[PDB]
Structures are given as structure tokens and as C-alpha cells.
Write a structure and sequence with these properties.
The structure holds 2 protein chains of 2 kinds. Chain A has 16 helices and 14 strands. Chain A has a 3-stranded antiparallel β-sheet. A 3-stranded antiparallel β-sheet of chain A has the order 12-13-14. Helices cover 42% and strands 14% of the residues of chain A. In chain A, helix 10 packs across helix 12. Chain B is α/β, with parallel strands linked by helices. In chain B, the strands form 3 sheets. Chain B has a 5-stranded parallel β-sheet, with helices on both faces. Chain B has a two-stranded antiparallel sheet with strand order 4-8. The chains are: A alpha+beta, B alpha/beta. Bound molecules: iron/sulfur cluster (2 copies), carbonmonoxide-(dicyano) iron, FE3-S4 cluster (F3S), magnesium ion and nickel (II) ion (NI). The site of one iron/sulfur cluster (SF4) has 14 residues of chain B, from helix 9. Carbonmonoxide-(dicyano) iron (FCO) binds next to helix 13 and helix 16 of chain A. Chain B: Belongs to the [NiFe]/[NiFeSe] hydrogenase small subunit family. Chain B: It is an enzyme of class 1 (oxidoreductase).
Chain lengths: 544, 262
Amino acid sequence: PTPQSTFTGPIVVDPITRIEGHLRIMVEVENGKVKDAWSSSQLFRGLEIILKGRDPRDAQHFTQRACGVCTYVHALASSRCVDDAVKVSIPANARMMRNLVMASQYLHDHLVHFYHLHALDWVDVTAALKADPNKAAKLAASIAPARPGNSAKALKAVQDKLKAFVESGQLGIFTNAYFLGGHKAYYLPPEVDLIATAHYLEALHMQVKAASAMAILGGKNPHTQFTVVGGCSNYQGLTKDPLANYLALSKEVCQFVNECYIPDLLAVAGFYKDWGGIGGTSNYLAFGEFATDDSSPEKHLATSQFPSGVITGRDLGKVDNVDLGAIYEDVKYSWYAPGGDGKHPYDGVTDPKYTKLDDKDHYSWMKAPRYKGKAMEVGPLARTFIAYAKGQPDFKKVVDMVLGKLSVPATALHSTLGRTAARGIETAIVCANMEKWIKEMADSGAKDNTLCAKWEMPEESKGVGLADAPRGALSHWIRIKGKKIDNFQLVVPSTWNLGPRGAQGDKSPVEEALIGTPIADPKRPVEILRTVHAFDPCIACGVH
Amino acid sequence: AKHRPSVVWLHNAECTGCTEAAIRTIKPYIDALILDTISLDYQETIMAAAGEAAEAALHQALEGKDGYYLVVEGGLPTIDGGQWGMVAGHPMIETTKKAAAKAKGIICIGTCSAYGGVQKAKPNPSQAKGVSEALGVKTINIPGCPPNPINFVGAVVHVLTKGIPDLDENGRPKLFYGELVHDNCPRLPHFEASEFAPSFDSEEAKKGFCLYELGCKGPVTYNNCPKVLFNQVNWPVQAGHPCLGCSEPDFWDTMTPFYEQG
Ligand code: SF4
Ligand code: SF4
Ligand code: FCO
Ligand code: F3S
Ligand SMILES: [Mg+2]
Ligand code: NI
């Protein structure tokens, strides 16, 4: 069964590595299972304060620097936000180009997260040294598509490289790893460790290509520079050779998704099937992404191909529409001044006030976003459940493939394993849509290259920009007064997932998911990392 | 086994775009760099250890017998005793100061570590500062938001193999930052002919006219973007968008409004 100590006491993990940003996790453990949790974000920058009084056209450039991991997404949400505030409807080519860049972001973001951020929670790299490479080649044939990268020779070269590295005594990023000397929570056969380690290294190269693809349309990566109020600036991105290169590069990236990412995810998921009973939450939210109609926030919600919705209490039979008026943020357990509870983002307040480390009354730089009083999990799992509930055919098919491979019910996805699985599921689906989406823009841009619409700065207005970023439901909210930024508020997916308690004292999604986490070894609490990493935390995003 | 030079990489007030930019290197790729060239001994984004195990990894590196080079990503928030930016219960200013003290060299990757960056923009609620200001020591600055990995990895290899490269007045290697963006821009002939796009929807824009009237800061920005490109494919002005001047100190305040020259 699942290894579990008899440990009773506190565990603090700070820093949480292999995330973006600065997170401290505090838990109380009783008899080897987590009984209470706190998600404590440790950096404030204050972009919303910085934005006040500025030109609304500048917003996207400041807010993109909320995060370099989910690069682009904030420039996009800010652009959608200001487009809405000035009431301009972007041209078709701009919708298409903006959406493809998001699709590119998903591919790069999710590949890097699985291999370079999450995998080391499940894969013992040093155990790969014990594998026989011929036995590993055989096993690779039985869990994944045939590929030369999975040959005995290829897997030996990886093993030899790893061996020479370990024997040098400079373990670099593997220094003091939780798997060193073995660990009861690490289940994989050495051969699977070897296989995944080869892909880890391959993935370091593949992500370069995924970023290059994105940069053809985005101008550069990280931090794209192609969006403007009224659409996009990149006329070159509608032309033939750049689109052929973008398709060619996207197809390499997707071949790697299908040959390596999904099969490694499924292999890991098969060995860690017990993680289907750990780390579940109840409520899910998505604003949707990949809309056919982005003329307004309402059209986005209604036409997103990855649909929007609200699920509550795991009830897959009742996907509610998103009520943007029902979103608010609490500050009661956060490092902000008193009086700031229950604020809709149009009326958001960001008034920093620190107390002290591990003050249970005020313990995070994140606000606590709530929806009609409820915490909401956002991200790939939220999107996957909403699409599945709604019978979106790509999700129904891929989810069913996953449930069939694992021989598990759909309820098993309400867990850390499901959260991890959902991230791959939607990456496979983005991949299967790339060519159709690329052809739509190629053909459209051939016929007419309109990319940016005319618009006028209002004296006073407000607007909202919605996106489902790789980590989930993202919204930027502006008030314009005297043609300047009067208020600008970001509510970001990691704020939804990893923020603290709201005004009712109610745990956020990560805090709730942490309850019942078993700890095989309190010295080396990988189980905390597993669940926290599955939410794909971005603390610079969460706090801004 | 030949000894590989120890690199300690700290993250303070940052978006992690600099880390992301570094791993876009292709000469060499990042795996070859850390397997063959350097010993990357602390790096919160990708390191296996967490919590107390990661803190101990840091302290082993800082106490290494052969010494280490320091990379700093992010500015330093100094308000409130440094407590608005903490790692392992320690103010980031404190840990950077400590790591910097015995560092063989300090490279600031990004405008944030170099100059203070986005969190330093008015009204700077965290009292963020650049590393050199906060510590009172000279730094090798690889600015940009983010810098090109060519520039960062170039500096690193240069420092380990040749010494400190020649720096300009803002601490930047002349190899990469010696030339204005503008002087290498393919739209230069348009700038010279006073052929400027009045808007992004204009026919002038469609024809690739100069973006100066739309706020391009290329003429006052030092970087090698048009010469080296990003991701082997593109750069902002090629994507039809003005330069923000993102490698210049305090650009958040000196180069705004971004769509104007005012
Ligand atoms: S310089 Fe720019 S990309 Fe680098 S950490 Fe700062 S905000 Fe992020
Ligand atoms: S587009 Fe910018 S860098 Fe290029 S010629 Fe015009 S002002 Fe100079
Ligand atoms: N994805 C992503 Fe970043 C977070 N949380 C944003 O938005
Ligand atoms: S915005 Fe920055 S990346 Fe180059 S083109 Fe201008 S210096
Ligand atoms: Mg906010
Ligand atoms: Ni992010």
C-alpha cells in the first residue's frame, strides 16, 4: 500500500522549488497524514499599484512581467481587457493569431512543467544508473511509440552521461534530492527511471523548438511583442514561409508530445495509481480558451473551443455559466490592510501590510479569490472536467482513452494524479488542433491581411479581459478615468489555486488538496511536492 | 573527472523570464552547459531538493572549497527590513548579500537584478533596488527583459574562460550591448526617409515603415536584437512592434508611454 510514517508534528517546506516564484508551505501532520495546511506566498511586487495613473496602452507591457513562465498570457489578458474598455472588436486575423500564440504557450509550458518541474517528484534519476539499457529498450517498446530515441544504444548514451556526471561528485541540481539513497514513495522500476530521464534531457532541447514556433508569431520568447490595442502588429506572421516554419516546428513538438510526454505520463500514472485517491478538490472554474468569437468577454465565454463553466461539489451534471459579477477577492488572511474583503476586481484594493512570518491570521501575499463564497480550482483539470461534462468530443475521446488505459473511473481524476493527467490530456488536444488552426489563419491572411482595427480612447470606461492560461482562469480588470488607468486589477489562476483562506476561514484549493497527504518520510516530504506541483504554481502570477 | 566551476543562481523579485530566457540557449544547449561546462549548484526553478534540503544545497555551494560564481535574477525589495521578499524565512537582500561576499564574480541576468526592473517602477511600493545599488558592489549586467541567452551564456563562458569582458557605463558587456538597436534595424532606410507608420492598421505599417512615430525606442536602446534575433527566428520590430527599450536602466519610467516619444 501507500507508504506512510507515524509522524505527528509540523512540516515547513520553504522554498518550494520547481515552481515559478516564492512559496512556503506549512502543514500539520498527524500519524503520517497531513491534517492542516497553509499556502504562504513570500514575494510582493505590486504591479497593480505601479499601473495606477499610467497610459492604458502601456498596461500589457507591465502586466506581461507578472510572469516569464506563462509569458504572453498577461499581455493577452491586458490586451483583451483594454480592447473591451475601448469597445473595439479585433479583426479575425488578430483573434486567430492571438489564439495560436496561446496554443504555442500551452505546448511549451506543459512540456517544461511535466519534465523539468514535476517529474523529479516521481522519477528517481540516480536509480536510472541501475537499469539495464536493453531491458529498458524492451520496456520502452511496450509503453510508448517506436522511436530511435528509445533504442538501447540511445538509452545507454543517456545512462553513460548520467553515470559520468554522478561519479564526478558534482550533482548540481540533483544535490540533496529526496530520492537520493532510495525513498519509499518512489515506485518506478530503474528502467522507467532511465526512460523518463532520457526524455527529460530530450525535452530540454524540444522546448527550444516550442519557443521558436511561438516567437514566429510572437516576435520573441520570453515576453512576446506583437499585440496592440485593436489586434496585432505582426503582418509577417500571416505570410507563407513563416507559417510553414511554424507548422513544421509545431509538428516536431507534437510528435514529442505523443511519443514521449503522454506515454511517460501514463506509465507514471499506472505505477502511482494510489495517487488517484489523494489531493482532490470539489469546485472548478474556467473562462474557456480558443474562442471562435472574441468580440467581447461574453462571446469569449460562450464560444471558447475549450469551454467555460463552473462545476460545484464534483457535480458533472450541472455546468453553470460563468457569472463575472460573482467573482471577488478577500484579504482577511493576507498581508493587506483591513477593510479589503469581498471586493469585485473593478473595485479591487491593493494596500500592502506585512505582519510577520507564519502569522496564522495573515500569512500570504496572495489575495483569496472566491466565487459566491466558494473557492475554485482552475487549470487543466478544471478545463478537462468542464469539457468532459459538456461532451466536447476531443476531451471525451482523450479522457476516455486515459480512463481506459488506467482502468479507473472518471471520479479518479478528482486527485493529484488526475490534475497531472489533465495537463497532458489537453496538451494532446491542443496538438491535434494546431494544423486546422494554422490553416485557418494562413488561408484568412492570404485573402486579406487586416490585423488591427481602429479605435478611440474613451475619457471614462471599464473593461475585462479573460483568458484560460496554461494554469487556468485569468482576468484583467481596468477602470479608465481621464483616459488614464484609474484602477487595474489582475486575478490570476495561481491566486485562485494557491491563495490563502478567504474571509470565512475557508481553505483554498491547494490547502484543501493537501489534507490527507500521506508522508512516508517526514525528513523528505515528496508527497507535499507532488500535490503542490500538480497545481503548477506560479507565485509571481498569484501575487503580481 | 575535470572540476566544473560552481555557479550559484539566486531568484529575488523576478518573473522567472530570465531563467526561461537562459534555457533557450543553443550554443551550447542548457544540458550540455550544466553537464559539461559549469556545476549549477543552486537554482530554485529546476533543482531537485526543496525546503531545508535546498537551503543546505545553497550553503554547501557557498562553502565550496573551489569557490563559486554568482548569478542573480531579480531586484531586491528593501522595504520593511527586506521582508516583502523572502526565501527560507530570510530576506532576499540578506541572502544575496551573503552569497555575493565570497563570489568570484557576480552576473546580474535581466534588467531587474541589474537596475531594479519592473517592481522598481513608480511608485516602487516594495522599495526595490538593483543588486549593485543594494549591495554596493560592481556587477556584470546582462540586461533586457529578458536578455538574449546569447548575451547571458556568452558572458558566463567569457567570465570562466577569459576574465571580465569590457563593460559600458551601465555595467554591460560591449560585445553584446555596444550598438544601438536602431543602427542595425532593417527599417533604418524608412527612418532616414521620414517614412513612419501613423498607426498599426495603416498601409504604412503593412509596408514595414519605421515605427518611431508609434514610440519605438530603438534609437536610444543598446542591444543586439536585430543582429542575433530571438529564438533563431524573430525580433519585436520584425514582428511589426516598437522597441520598449527594455535593456535600458529604469526603462519602465524613462521609456513610457511606450507608444509615444513624448
Ligand atoms: S528582467 Fe524582465 S524577464 Fe527578467 S526577471 Fe525582470 S521582469 Fe522578468
Ligand atoms: S523601427 Fe525603431 S529601430 Fe527601426 S529604424 Fe525605426 S525607430 Fe529605428
Ligand atoms: N498560466 C499561468 Fe500564470 C499563473 N497562475 C497566469 O496567468
Ligand atoms: S524591447 Fe527589448 S528585446 Fe530588444 S527590441 Fe527592444 S531591446
Ligand atoms: Mg490582483
Ligand atoms: Ni505564470
